[PDB]
């Protein structure tokens, strides 16, 4: 896949959590998981094209966390081949470094306290995993080789049985 996974960044981005972890919204504005979505409320339902499936995580056709209803967030394709993303505030980890990671998904090693329900926005479960769905390839054409698996996620107290594609 051209110039998307070639030099995006290593999956082991440097820097760790120097201390407490809080919320942040850098208004960052997605071939690779090194991205930051933005919280978007009311939107003009004119240029949106194709499915609008959003990740609960359980995909379902002003997003909010399952504890507060709504959904974590989602992405869409619209206009002339442009991808847009949205979701809860991009989770950030308190630390130091030239390229400190603003975790948009689960990231254990770089920070011990980061659970998806509290530190994830989009469909990235782990840096090398995705929640498969019919338009997954339509949205992330760089992830064809990933192998499918079946997983159980306990969000709050609700158990979700879903298939996830991860590299191996």
């Amino acid at each position: 896949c051209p110039e998307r996974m070639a030099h995006c960044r290593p999956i082991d981005e440097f820097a760790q959590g120097w201390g407490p972890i809080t919320y942040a919204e850098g208004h960052g504005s997605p071939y690779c998981w090194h991205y930051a979505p933005r919280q978007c409320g009311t939107i003009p339902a004119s240029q949106v094209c194709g499915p609008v499936y959003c990740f609960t995580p359980s995909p379902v056709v002003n997003n909010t966390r399952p504890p507060q209803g709504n959904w974590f967030g989602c992405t869409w394709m619209n206009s002339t081949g442009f991808t847009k993303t949205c979701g809860g505030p991009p989770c950030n980890i308190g630390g130091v470094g030239n390229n400190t990671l603003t975790c948009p998904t689960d990231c254990f090693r770089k920070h011990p306290e980061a659970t998806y329900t509290k530190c994830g926005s989009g469909p990235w479960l782990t840096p090398r995993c995705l929640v498969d769905y019919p338009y997954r390839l339509w949205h992330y054409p760089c992830t064809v080789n990933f192998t499918i698996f079946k997983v159980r996620m306990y969000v709050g107290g609700v158990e979700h049985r879903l298939n996830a594609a991860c590299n191996i």
Partner: antibody
Amino acid sequence: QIQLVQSGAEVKKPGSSVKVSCRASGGSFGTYGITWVRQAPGQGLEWVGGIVPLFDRPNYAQKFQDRVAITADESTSTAYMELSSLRFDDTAVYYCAREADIVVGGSSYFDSWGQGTLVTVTK
Amino acid sequence: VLTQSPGTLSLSPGERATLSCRASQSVSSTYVAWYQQKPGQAPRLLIYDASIRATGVPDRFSGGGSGTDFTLTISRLEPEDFAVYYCQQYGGSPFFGGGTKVEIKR
């Protein structure tokens, strides 16, 4: 399904650490969780911890938190369990097990166990 | 949260025995697994979900339950059925149960 569960610290001293190991021969390491369950000499089996070496987020039972660290090394196909703050009650045998299906935040049922290793805490 | 009613138990071959594991408060969404420990060997799996049998085990060991009081019926006992049977519930609240004893020396 061949577990070479390492005999670790057979004899220890109170307050010290123990570093037990388990190895999964064959198959494809990185798709099935390794689960550690202990049992005292005569007692019931108590869940201790578990890991799934693809979603790096080991789970521990509520009463075994901040005191147990479970790690896995994909390169060598080895799951280590480091148990700290030993007490005279810890005298037990710590088995190894496989999780039938991957779990994130939960557990599962142990399909194929491994050899039980004795870890005696004495002074 | 989970306990076994019968406590100790002793019988002779060709008998029917019942063991009951109590799901205290939550229905738990039908998650159960039963083990069998011999006097020194590692435990082995017999049932999971309380309704599906494992591979390599005879039909003698049965499963059943709906909501609460999952059961493990041991009919037509044999000399090779001396073991301290164990109960656990998995899912979101993994916690083993109590160990009912069994004696086949009769």
